[PDB]
Amino acid sequence: LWAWDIVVDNCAICRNHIMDLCTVAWGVCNHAFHFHCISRWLKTRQVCPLDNREWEFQKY
Amino acid sequence: GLKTMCECMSSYLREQGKALVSEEGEGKNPVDYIQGLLDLKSRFDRFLLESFNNDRLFKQTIAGDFEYFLNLNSRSPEYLSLFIDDKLKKGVKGLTEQEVETILDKAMVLFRFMQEKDVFERYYKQHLARRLLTNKSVSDDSEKNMISKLKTECGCQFTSKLEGMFRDMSISNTTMDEFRQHLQATGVSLGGVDLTVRVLTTGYWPTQSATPKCNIPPAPRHAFEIFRRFYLAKHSGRQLTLQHHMGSADLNATFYTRKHILQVSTFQMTILMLFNNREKYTFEEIQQETDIPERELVRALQSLACGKPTQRVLTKEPKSKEIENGHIFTVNDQFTSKLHRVKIQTVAAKQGESDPERKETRQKVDDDRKHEIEAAIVRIMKSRKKMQHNVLVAEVTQQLKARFLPSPVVIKKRIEGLIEREYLARTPEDRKVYTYVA
Numbered sequence: 001l002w003a004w005d006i007v008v009d010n011c012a013i014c015r016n017h018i019m020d021l022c023t024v025a026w027g028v029c030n031h032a033f034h035f036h037c038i039s040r041w042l043k044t045r046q047v048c049p050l051d052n053r054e055w056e057f058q059k060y
Numbered sequence: 061g062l063k064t065m066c067e068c069m070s071s072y073l074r075e076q077g078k079a080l081v082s083e084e085g086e087g088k089n090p091v092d093y094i095q096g097l098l099d100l101k102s103r104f105d106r107f108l109l110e111s112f113n114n115d116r117l118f119k120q121t122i123a124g125d126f127e128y129f130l131n132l133n134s135r136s137p138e139y140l141s142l143f144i145d146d147k148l149k150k151g152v153k154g155l156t157e158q159e160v161e162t163i164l165d166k167a168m169v170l171f172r173f174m175q176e177k178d179v180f181e182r183y184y185k186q187h188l189a190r191r192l193l194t195n196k197s198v199s200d201d202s203e204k205n206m207i208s209k210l211k212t213e214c215g216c217q218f219t220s221k222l223e224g225m226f227r228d229m230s231i232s233n234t235t236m237d238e239f240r241q242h243l244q245a246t247g248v249s250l251g252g253v254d255l256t257v258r259v260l261t262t263g264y265w266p267t268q269s270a271t272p273k274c275n276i277p278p279a280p281r282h283a284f285e286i287f288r289r290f291y292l293a294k295h296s297g298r299q300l301t302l303q304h305h306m307g308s309a310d311l312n313a314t315f316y317t318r319k320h321i322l323q324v325s326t327f328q329m330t331i332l333m334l335f336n337n338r339e340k341y342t343f344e345e346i347q348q349e350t351d352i353p354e355r356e357l358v359r360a361l362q363s364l365a366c367g368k369p370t371q372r373v374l375t376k377e378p379k380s381k382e383i384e385n386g387h388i389f390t391v392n393d394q395f396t397s398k399l400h401r402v403k404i405q406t407v408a409a410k411q412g413e414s415d416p417e418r419k420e421t422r423q424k425v426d427d428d429r430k431h432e433i434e435a436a437i438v439r440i441m442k443s444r445k446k447m448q449h450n451v452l453v454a455e456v457t458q459q460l461k462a463r464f465l466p467s468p469v470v471i472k473k474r475i476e477g478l479i480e481r482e483y484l485a486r487t488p489e490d491r492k493v494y495t496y497v498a
Binding site for chain 1: 225228232235260261262264265289291292295296297298299431432434435436438439477480481482483498
């Protein structure tokens, strides 16, 4: 229905660099987050500095 | 004096286990293999309980021997997953509730002995996903109870990810069912086919990295457009994973006597549509117009014309093990058939995976585990805000023991990446100096 735009460079302030070391996970607004942002908010830090607000994702 | 016979029995058990799990010969039935391990374990337990009246030393010895000889097979967890999956599947000898519970308890006990539980967890997740997609669940509550028991046996820290993934899969399945019911009540549809709407997110699911593309005919195109419109009418902007790689539907199609419902796979759907609409279609042209995989095309050919004589209404050239280009086939509906609905039997071969496919899956799982370990390594340093060269390695190995095996290379890579990405306030040159930034 609608394409997914997670921003190749950076969706927002993620503190994780444009790399897979630090997209699939849905965002807060169900518009998908950046690959770096999702990885940073998954298991990198207790407080997620990757989507302004705390991001944790849900759903399989 | 009680020690002296422990060595002999441990050596005998180790030799017996090595002989039983030896790679000499192929085509070993995973079910028979797991049955043999279970029988050996039961015999040892009976011997210990009868004569050794539950001695701690013998229990420790047998546990150590089992841990030693269990991980001798890299592919062993996959067969364990198959054995714990098909047994839970309906029709498995009509196992009683008590028998199923005992089998699950034994499987959980064995899962405790596995050294590399990450591969076992991945295989269990894949098997559960396949069973859910098989649409042949016996008891979802029983599966949930088994998952909870396995998580409790394996430990909360080790199985938190597995429990979360199972809960997410259950929630996604419930949401998909509710959305399908609402769309049906929506006083609408896209073609009247079976509501096999697999519109579910692949964020935490075992989705294949490659998504096959199937040539959607005008009817399939209209169905896809209607499904997309309904999904937009249900959740605007959001778009879950609904790839047509494993798309399934049930509709009546006639190729040009008796009305029959045809059940075909996603790859076979394009061929059926070509035969239903056109008269003569070459195999090369159909494959080019659909981009179906070679394995998928071979499976469709085997299940279409090379199957039972009752369903053999087309004589493909050639309809044998070999595949010949330009195989002209026609869907002759006038042929006599017994079943009212023509449902293609699923290709369920012996439990296992292709050697290249298994190697690729193992490599992907290992890469994911390495990435997770590297990500979690920085957490140990951040928690203490300081670590040494050996201290960081010990901390990483503390959290990377039950799930997997820690490696110095992963720790070094994580330490370097902490400085590189500035996630942690450490220095690659100064290993003694370590801090946290993020």
